[PDB]
Amino acid sequence: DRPIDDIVKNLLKFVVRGFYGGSFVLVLDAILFHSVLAEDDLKQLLSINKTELGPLIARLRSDRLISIHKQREYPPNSKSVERVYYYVKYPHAIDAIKWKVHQVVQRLKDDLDKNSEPNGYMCPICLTKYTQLEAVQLLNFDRTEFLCSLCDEPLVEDDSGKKNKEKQDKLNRLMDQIQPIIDSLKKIDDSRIEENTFEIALARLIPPQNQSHAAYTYNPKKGSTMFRPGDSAPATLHINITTASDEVAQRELQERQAEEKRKQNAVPEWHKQSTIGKTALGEERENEKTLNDYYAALAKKQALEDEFEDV
C-alpha cells in the first residue's frame, strides 16, 4: 500500500482519460478498482455487451496497459471452462507509456525540423513530389520552369512554408498538456516497482459480485514444467502474575528440583559402605471479636468435513 502504487494508478487514469475515449476509462478503471476482473464480471459491471467490450479490451492489450491470463476451471457441477481474467502489469504499462510519449514528442520534433527545410515541388497532374535537389535537374532548356519527367508539365511549388509557427505551437501545447505524465514518470523512476502477476494481483482483490461464476483463485497444475510466453516475472507472549502464594510455590518447586539434581549424582549404596558380610546377590476468634468491639468503642469515645489442522 505504498504511495508508489497510488502514483502509478494516477498515471494510468490520466493517460487513459487523456489519450482514450470514454468506454476505455470505464474498462480500465474497473480493473484498477478491482485488481483482477473476469470477462463476464467486467461485462456485468459496465452493462456492455461482448461486441462493445471487444475493441476496448483489444486496444488496451495492444498498448499493454492491460494483461490477459487464461486458466482452466473445474466447477463442481458444470463442464470445465477456460476463463479469462484481466489485470494491470505496471512495469509493462509504465514502459509502454514512456516509449509512446517519447515517440510522440520525437515525431513532432522531427516534423518541426523538417518544416524548416525548403518546401520542394510536386506535379499537379501525376501528384509526384520532387525535392529541391531533384527538381533542380529537371528545369527546361530555357531555365524558366521545372518540367515533370512523367508528364512534361511545369511543376508547382509545395505548401507548408508558413506552417513553421503552427508546428511550434503544436509542440508547445503537447508539452503543456503532458506535464503530469512527465512528473509522474519521474516519481516512478525514483522508486522501484515490483512486477505484478495474476497471483499477486489477487491479493488486492475486491469481489465485484456476490456469486460471480468465475473463481478468483490460482491453482497451477502440480509438477507442470510447461512454460508459456509472457507468464513469468523476476509468536505469542505468555504472562503469569506471581503472588505470595505463587512465589512460595515456585521456591518449593525450585528446592525440589535442586534435591532431585543432588540425588542424581549421589554415589550408590554399594560404593559407600564395604559390603562383605551381607548375603550374596542372587478460642482465638472470640478474642479477636471482643478486641474489635473494644477498639470500635474507643474510636467512638474519642470522636461439512474437510482436511484441517490445529492453529
Binding site: 469481489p207 490460482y218 505469542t236 502474575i241 506471581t242 503472588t243 478486641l291 474519642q302 482436511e307
Partner: protein, 230 residues
C-alpha cells in the same frame, strides 16, 4: 493489509475485516452488495483451524464455546489468508490466555506513635502474647489505653518501620526477560516498580483498568507493543 481482505462466506463473496479498536475485538464480513452482514466476536471463539498449506483449497474455520457454534471463511489468495490467520491467532491466543488467568483466580516521633491508633491495632492483631496482656490490662483492669503504649515505644516504632521503608530506584524494565510462545513472569512488586519509574505506563494503565479490558490483558498488549521496546 492484515486488517482487511477478500473472502467468501456461505458461498457468497465479500470483504472480511478485523476491528481491534472496539473492545472486545470482532470480525465482520460484509457481502459485495452489502445486503448480507455477519459479525463474530473473538471473545466467544475458542479454537481456530486452518486447512494444510499443501491442500489447494484454502479455508479457515472458527469454533467457539457452547452443538458448538462454527464459522467458516474461504479466501482467494493464500498470502491474505496467512496474514488474516496470523492476526486471528494472536487475538485468539491472547483472549484464551486471559480466560485461563481468570479461571485461575514526624511519623517516628514518640508522640505520634502513641496517637497512631491504627498502628496500635495492627501490631496487636499480629502479635498474640502482647494482645493477651493488653486485653487483661485494659478490658477488665481499666488502665488507660494511652498509658499502656507509653512504656512500649521502641516496639511500636520497630513495627512501623517494618512497612514504611521502600527499595531504591532501579531499571525495572531491564530486569524483565521474555525467556513461538515465551513465558515471562511478573510480580506485584515488579508491577509497582514499573508504574513508579515510568509514569506513561501508569497513565496508559489507569485508563484501561476496568474500562478497556481486564488488567491481565493490558500487560500482554504492553509487552508486545513498541512502547515497551522504546
Amino acid at each position: 493489509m492484515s486488517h482487511s481482505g477478500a473472502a467468501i462466506f456461505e458461498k457468497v463473496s465479500g470483504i472480511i475485516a478485523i476491528n481491534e479498536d472496539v473492545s472486545p475485538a470482532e470480525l465482520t464480513w460484509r457481502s459485495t452488495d452489502g445486503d448480507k452482514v455477519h459479525t463474530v466476536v473473538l471473545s466467544t471463539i475458542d479454537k481456530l483451524q486452518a486447512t494444510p498449506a499443501s491442500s489447494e483449497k484454502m479455508m479457515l474455520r472458527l469454533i467457539g464455546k457452547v452443538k458448538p457454534q462454527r464459522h467458516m471463511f474461504s479466501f482467494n489468495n493464500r498470502t491474505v489468508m496467512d496474514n488474516i490467520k496470523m492476526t486471528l491467532q494472536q487475538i485468539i491466543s491472547r483472549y484464551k490466555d486471559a480466560d485461563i488467568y481468570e479461571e485461575k483466580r514526624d511519623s517516628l516521633s514518640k508522640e505520634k506513635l502513641l496517637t497512631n491508633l491504627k498502628l496500635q491495632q495492627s501490631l496487636l492483631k499480629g502479635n498474640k502474647v502482647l494482645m493477651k496482656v493488653f486485653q487483661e490490662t485494659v478490658i477488665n483492669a481499666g488502665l488507660p489505653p494511652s498509658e499502656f503504649w507509653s512504656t512500649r515505644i521502641p516496639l511500636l516504632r520497630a513495627f512501623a518501620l517494618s512497612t514504611s521503608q521502600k527499595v531504591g530506584p532501579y531499571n525495572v524494565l531491564s530486569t524483565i526477560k521474555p525467556v513461538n510462545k515465551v513465558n515471562v513472569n511478573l510480580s506485584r512488586e515488579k508491577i509497582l516498580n514499573i508504574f513508579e519509574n515510568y509514569p506513561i505506563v501508569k497513565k496508559a494503565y489507569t485508563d484501561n483498568v476496568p474500562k478497556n479490558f481486564k488488567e491481565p490483558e493490558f500487560w500482554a498488549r504492553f509487552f508486545s507493543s513498541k512502547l515497551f521496546r522504546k
